[PDB]
Every structure is written in C-alpha cells, then in structure tokens.
Design a protein around this ligand. Structure first.
Ligand SMILES: Nc1nc2c(ncn2[C@@H]2O[C@@H]3COP(=O)(O)O[C@H]4[C@@H](O)[C@H](n5cnc6c(=O)[nH]c(N)nc65)O[C@@H]4COP(=O)(O)O[C@H]3[C@H]2O)c(=O)[nH]1
Ligand SMILES: Nc1nc2c(ncn2[C@@H]2O[C@@H]3COP(=O)(O)O[C@H]4[C@@H](O)[C@H](n5cnc6c(=O)[nH]c(N)nc65)O[C@@H]4COP(=O)(O)O[C@H]3[C@H]2O)c(=O)[nH]1
Lengths: 137, 139
C-alpha cells in the first residue's frame, strides 16, 4: 500500500521536491501532509480522491442527488453520525451505504456498524449538506 | 491569469516540471499535437489540464455535473445539433445570464458570439460533459 505522498507523486499532482518540502515542513508544524499540499496548490478534490483510493473508499464528487433513506439513518444515533463523520444513506445488496467525512474514520465506523457496508467519501461541504439532510434537528 | 500560455500556467501551479514542459514542446515541434494532449499522455492528470485551461479562458471548472438539473427552457436556446457541435450545454439562468457548460475552452468565443447574450461559462471533463449533454438533450 502506498503513502499519500507517493500516490500523488505517481499521479503527477506534485513533484518530488514538493513532497520532500512538505514532509520537511510537517516535521516542524505537525500539519497533516494533505493540508500542506492543498495549501501549496493541490486541489482538495484531488487530495480526497487519493485518500479514498488509499483506504478503499469511493469518492463522491457530489451528494446533491442523494435522498437519505431514513431506515439506514436509524443505524447510527445522530450524535454518533456527527462524532464519527458518517452518514448511512441507504442499502445495496445487503450492505449499508455510508458516506464518511474523513477516510481515517473508516475502521472505527466499520467496527461499530458491525455489518457489511460500502464506504463513500465526500468533501466537507457536501458531507455537511448530506448530514443535515439525513439527520435533521 | 487570462494572459498566460498553458505551459506557463501549469508551471505556475506546480503541476508540471520545466523538463516535462520542454520535452512536450519539442515533441510538438515535430508532431503538431495539441500541447495539453502531449502533457497528459506523458502523465499530467487530465483534471490538472482542465483546471489550468479553465483559468486561462476565465471559465469555472466543474468538478462534477451529476448535481445539475438542466433547465429545459435554457436548453431551447441551442438546437441539439449546435449543443453537440459546439460542445455547449445551456443549463439554466442566473441574474439574467445563461449558464453554459463547455466541453472545450477553445469554443468559448464561438459559443458566446452565437448566444449573443450575457452568459456564464463552465468547463467540465469529457465524461461529465457527455453525461450532462445526454440529460439536457436526449435523442
Ligand atoms: N482527512 C485527511 N487525512 C490525511 C490528510 N493527509 C494525510 N492523511 C491521512 O492521515 C494519515 C496521517 O497522515 P500524516 O499526519 O500526514 O502522516 C503521514 C506522513 O507524515 C507521512 N508520509 C506520508 N506520505 C509520505 C510519502 O509519500 N513519502 C514519505 N517518505 N513519507 C510520507 O506518513 C504518515 C502516514 O501517511 P499515510 O499512510 O498516507 O496516512 C495518512 C493519511 O491516510 C489530510 O489532509 N486530510
Ligand atoms: N481543449 C484543449 N485546449 C488546449 C490543449 N492544449 C492547449 N490548449 C489550448 O489550445 C490552444 C492551442 O494550444 P497549442 O496548439 O498546443 O499551441 C500552443 C503551444 O504550441 C504553444 N506553447 C503552449 N504553451 C507554451 C508555454 O508554456 N511556453 C512556450 N514557450 N510555448 C507554449 O503556444 C501555443 C498557444 O498556447 P495557449 O496560449 O496556451 O493556447 C492553447 C491552449 O489554450 C488541450 O489539450 N485541450
């Protein structure tokens, strides 16, 4: 499995020197590598596609057409949906479809859901819009 | 940003190296291929090409067309044959401008002259463009 910097280097979004400079910057700042690269010109959508590939998620370019199934939303308390950044939106072939806000949360969410699931990843605004739709207050 | 060449823009953005751009331009010297086509074939992400080309012609790059509900009244402003020939899908209206999604930034001027009215242009990747076209203009 590839690290994020290598995935992006291979794709050609960043240069070798750019990756080295970002890693050197991270040694002093503690920032996530992805945030540094985005600040230096990596599109956020390109970052998220690479992070999705690294964790076996499907990146969703848009959430606007999703109609959240209330039956699926039942599988997480709203408080858990927010804290874990996970919106169950529906079912497909006996799996619950779940949209994550952060690929790092895949494992924690999957363990908790404890059932076959298909994981998606969405950018922060599209995720928030989808979350409010599925879990209205 | 509208005054820079494609290579310069990609260099400025950190998406191409000076070496890669030199190679591509020298090969174009012999082949006459479109420059972005050469760069992509040598490994430039197609989306990096489209983002730079969008900046160059003042177009808004669309990461996705899947959330667009094409307004049938805007689609009337182009015959289907023109929509496909010019690679332009009129999708709606905002503030008295028509919103138009292009498949190729090089066609912006020809579409603008034809529409003859205030317009807001977008650029979408080929697959995303074709999907939107077929929705706005079923056969
Ligand atoms: N939601 C979100 N998640 C992000 C972001 N950036 C990175 N991640 C994810 O969070 C994990 C920790 O990244 P890190 O703090 O930068 O720590 C990274 C980084 O310090 C470092 N390193 C990362 N990439 C490379 C590389 O290409 N070459 C070398 N030599 N070291 C790398 O290894 C550590 C683990 O790398 P990864 O396996 O890829 O695991 C990454 C990656 O899965 C972001 O902006 N947003
Ligand atoms: N849909 C689409 N459009 C594309 C593509 N590649 C380039 N274009 C666009 O089409 C125009 C013609 O580019 P070209 O035939 O390769 O002709 C180019 C190229 O031969 C050359 N040249 C291009 N970039 C550079 C550069 O950075 N430095 C130098 N010295 N010469 C360049 O100057 C000419 C004008 O360049 P531009 O102003 O950028 O104008 C470009 C650019 O707007 C593509 O792959 N797909």
């Amino acid at each position: 499995d590839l690290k994020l910097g290598e995935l992006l280097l291979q794709k050609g979004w960043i240069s070798r020197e750019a990756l080295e400079e970002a890693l050197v910057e991270q040694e002093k700042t503690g920032d996530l590598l992805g945030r540094i690269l985005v600040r230096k010109g990596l599109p956020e959508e390109a970052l998220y596609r690479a992070l999705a590939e690294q964790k076996g998620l499907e990146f969703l370019e848009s959430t606007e057409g999703i109609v959240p199934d209330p039956s699926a939303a039942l599988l997480l308390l709203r408080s858990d949906a927010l804290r874990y950044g996970a919106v169950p939106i529906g079912f497909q072939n006996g799996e619950v479809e779940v949209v994550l806000s952060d690929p790092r949360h895949k494992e924690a969410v999957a363990q908790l859901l404890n059932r076959p699931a298909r994981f998606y990843l969405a950018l922060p605004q599209a995720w928030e819009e989808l979350f409010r739709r599925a879990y209205p207050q």
